[PDB]
Symmetry: D2
Subunit: 264 residues, 4 copies
């Protein structure tokens, strides 16, 4: 009986279903797949990418950038929600092909640098090509590109380095406060007495409160279904989207129920 073969990270088909750019605000565009968010922000001094999706999405992202008039060398910065394979997947290839820099907090930087391996909960089950962060970000630090200011808000739990990003765009010149909040799920995590993450419960509980207080007129999430976006229906995509409060409340109720189940 030989040792088992390695298994690939397979995902639902809708995560891999390309879509054309969908405008979110004057400078902000969804350019990922129907079920994975990847936000392009276009400024007068270059573009910013927030998340990339799965590793095989690199070519799709570059195609959608080209549709927006963004050449590979116009991509200045890549920001991340968290460094799991389904959001940071293509970062290594994008850096090689664009010359962009990556900015991340220390926790995200170290997980990105090992390609998602030795994950606190998944081990080596979900890996991707490693990448190096070029700028280390602190909680509340402001990153500016072309006059648009992105503020980082640390929200540990789903990963130690999970981060929300806020910025103000316009909608026909009128200001709109966008919040790109990270996942608050704990998929199959051991929550209580986890030797690799002893303070996991306390971090999640603080993070629910962080998300509740974000300045936000429009909430988006790395998995669009988590904030009730439907990228497939085009102009009506944001009709049913949740507020920050409703997203945090829904996430905390699932968390408390999962914690009670684990206890029992």
């Amino acid at each position: 009986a030989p040792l088992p073969q390695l298994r690939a990270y397979t995902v639902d088909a809708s995560w891999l279903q390309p879509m054309a750019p969908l405008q979110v605000a004057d400078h902000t565009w969804q350019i990922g797949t129907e079920d994975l968010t990847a936000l392009l922000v276009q400024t007068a001094e270059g573009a910013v990418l927030l998340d990339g999706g799965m590793p095989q999405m690199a070519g799709h992202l570059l195609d959608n950038m080209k549709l927006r008039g963004v050449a590979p060398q116009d991509l200045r910065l890549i920001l991340l929600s968290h460094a799991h394979a389904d959001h940071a997947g293509p970062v290594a290839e994008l850096k090689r092909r664009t010359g962009a820099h990556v900015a991340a907090n220390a926790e995200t930087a170290v997980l990105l640098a090992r390609g998602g391996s030795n994950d606190l909960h998944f081990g080596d089950g979900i890996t991707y090509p490693p990448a190096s962060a070029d700028r280390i970000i602190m909680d509340g630090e402001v990153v500016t590109v072309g006059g648009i200011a992105f503020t980082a808000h640390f929200m540990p739990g789903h990963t130690p380095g999970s981060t929300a990003w806020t910025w103000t765009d316009t909608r026909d010149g009128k200001p709109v406060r966008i919040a790109y909040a990270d996942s608050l799920s704990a998929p199959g995590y051991q929550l209580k007495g986890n030797p690799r993450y002893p303070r996991l419960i306390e971090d999640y509980k603080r993070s629910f409160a962080t998300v509740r207080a974000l300045p936000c007129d429009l909430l988006l999430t790395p998995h669009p279904g988590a904030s009730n976006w439907n990228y497939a229906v085009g102009s009506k995509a944001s009709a049913e989207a949740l507020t920050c409060n409703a997203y945090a409340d829904a996430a905390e109720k699932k968390f408390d129920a999962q914690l009670a189940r684990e206890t029992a």
Copy 2:
């Protein structure tokens, strides 16, 4: 008028004054200099080093280990308070010469990896040879070597990755709770509205409360004068040592006064 020459990091002579090993408890020894702490813990399965001091102290540390019967290959693990040049200085050389591993949190790992350069407050003024952390530690995580359990307690402020370490030794078989608490100083830091560390004040304030609640019968600090140790007087070294409460209280009063001065 040419550009200025580079300047070396020069320190008080007492920081560089070697001393013979001083026993702290049954398994725990101070083996650094009169004014820089470096703790050796000897177990049945190898030795642990907490801090190393300045870069030029590598040979002294190895000599003092040899006096304790610890061969270079018996050093299993290096733990750190924080990754400034006067505590993590010799880590790169010690790893090369012993085969030890380094364990650190993500913040300390990334600062260690750039040799203290691009420091949030010191820039490139105080650098040292870079080293890589082999094990990333989470807050409250327990590291065990030879049955002795070290628990990490994150106390950000002096650096983002500043860490206290606690363990229980014996004194002639009777248990003694040791706390190696990091610095709580802010030497020349901009505290308020610092763009590189927006939440510095909140982190320090939480850290004062963390240090107050450490389980501790005997407090030690990377700079021994900060907890009123006097390594030079041998057996009487710990006579005047502060409690955790007194150390945190004294540190917070200096912090509040410095913050009021900066305001004015």
Copy 3:
């Protein structure tokens, strides 16, 4: 039509077929699988591992070390032939579980650090958990553990960092010169005018001559079939093994034929 799913690196079953330790010489043991070499060298000051095989072989290797009386903390050093997933696969996990250091040349170190990704020929098709090299080795440099001296011989081609290792063991006290020579295959490589490896042909040709001149009484290779070893037949495993000259000659004839085919 969605993007393709990621594909796992699947290998022949015999590569994953565990075997008990097979003695090669007084201090040297094959402890990998029937079709992947992993050599354990036991000295008076600890053990050395040369190669590890596939990522999922970490537990098997630790089990076979335990059968030899080698505890996890007795493993001092890991050396590599080359940093493809089928030889460096488990290195990251072995370092975490043993405290060993890894020594490698600069080329191997950088490929190991990206987990085999962005391979000059395979792209991201064959990746594994990244690891960091602790000691960088130069051509002809001698690494000594417990009195046993390993000499590195660079033989670029299969990877830029491909390395042969030589050492002298005994067979009942009588000296035997062992050569662990790396692969000389070019599986599906573009050899001529390769933009990522412009001097590939010149490097292979020099490497054939390097292997021919190795001091060698007993040749072993990362893939045992390449030097006509048969690990499955126990005591007769080395009966048909090739000399260094015959291995290099056979490899060069395959290389020249492949190069003529590519031309045509």
Copy 4:
């Protein structure tokens, strides 16, 4: 008697003497100091920097780029001769302030990543802020920016990763072959039987032959005096410059004399 204080890397004043940009060819400019080369190549798609000089030269380089009409974000790529502090000094700061990428061979990448520490000959005596290489280059590989093609030629000896760069510029539309050849000095090196560089002599001897055969109408070197440039005399700076043959011949004669002295 305390341990010695750390010593700073001090250099001759002329190495730190700023100068205004000096045109070398239609697209190529010397923008470093009177005694340290730093070449700016301006293309239609951004600028390339070859070497930076000492760590404290970062601000000067950015000022001289601005005089040439090159904004910080127009700097696309940094190439290096070798990763000693007097040529790679400011690379870390330049990357942070420009968003440029660094391309280097594996040897140079690993020395750059440790900030020049653990140098084969200098130990930790001459360090600088570490930086990460973003693109790894192979011997003979071509790097293209804005249509201008740079070819790497490995010339190990002064460091293992020492590299010459060649490209074709114009002088009023007429082609001129430029060679930026690395140092061939061995300042205070142990050449024979060096345990850290066993094949040093063979590498130098091959490198002399590599430099002799470079395609070259105009030779430049990281230290301008080595190829008889005089940056201080402006238009006459290149009057007495050596050919590639004369530079290699002069370097080999010094090398042979130094080797005979070491023997005696």
